[PDB]
């Protein structure tokens, strides 16, 4: 009964280090340096990997959950990647946005530019998605909990107006 929409064509689009689940699920997880992929999935997650790098590797992420309109939720879990801190930069990326540099405003991240996302393209990220903060825990059951909260809570898919 919950409202759902087709994500673009061959979703998801861009190449990357992922598990694709469910296309309808609401639910994204990032695990930035840690290797739990197949625990938010197992969960029911539409789309779980990990994250590395505070610029290119958080473009793929934004570019692939913005052409699914069904997720509404990204989890950030495991432990944050030392020194280019993928977690933190992309939380200051969804609350302040970039400056006219395309510098993340915020971000504690060594390099945090996105140099090939339009404005656009991040002003529906912020829109379309929540952010759900679970960085450096790495425990399941918890993990497992947060994805099937999110998934009771499906506000179903996004539409701007
Ligand atoms: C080149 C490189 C950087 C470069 C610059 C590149 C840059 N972009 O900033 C430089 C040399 C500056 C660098 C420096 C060091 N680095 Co470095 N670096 C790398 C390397 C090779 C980057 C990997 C890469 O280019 N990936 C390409 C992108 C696309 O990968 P990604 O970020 O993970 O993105 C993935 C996601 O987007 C996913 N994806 C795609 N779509 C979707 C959708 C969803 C929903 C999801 C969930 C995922 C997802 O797929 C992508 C993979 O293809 C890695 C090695 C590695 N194992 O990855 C180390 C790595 C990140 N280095 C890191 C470290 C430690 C550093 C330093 C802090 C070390 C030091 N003390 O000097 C520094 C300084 C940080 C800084 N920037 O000043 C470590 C992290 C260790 C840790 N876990 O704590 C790594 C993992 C290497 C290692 N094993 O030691 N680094």
Redesign the pocket.
């Known amino acids: 009964m919950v409202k759902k929409k087709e994500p673009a064509e061959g979703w998801?689009v861009?190449?990357?280090?992922?598990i694709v689940g469910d296309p309808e699920s609401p639910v994204?997880?990032?695990?930035?340096?840690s290797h739990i992929?197949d625990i938010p999935i197992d969960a029911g997650a539409?789309?779980?990997?990990?994250?590395?790098?505070?610029?290119?590797?958080?473009?793929?992420?934004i570019?692939?959950?913005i052409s699914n309109p069904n997720?509404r939720f990204?989890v950030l879990c495991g432990?944050?990647?030392?020194?280019?801190i993928?977690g933190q930069s992309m939380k200051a990326l969804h609350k302040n946005g970039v400056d006219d540099k395309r510098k993340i405003i915020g971000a504690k991240?060594?390099?945090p530019y996105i140099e090939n996302l339009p404005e656009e393209a991040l002003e529906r990220f912020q829109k379309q998605v929540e952010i759900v903060d679970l960085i450096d825990v790495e425990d399941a059951d918890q993990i497992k909990e947060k994805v099937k909260e999110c998934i009771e809570k499906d506000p179903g898919a996004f539409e701007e107006e």
């Open positions: 998801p861009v190449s990357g280090d992922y994204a997880a990032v695990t930035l340096a992929e539409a789309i779980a990997g990990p994250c590395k790098t505070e610029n290119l590797g958080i473009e793929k992420v570019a692939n959950i997720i990204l432990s944050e990647v030392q020194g280019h993928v991240g060594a390099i």
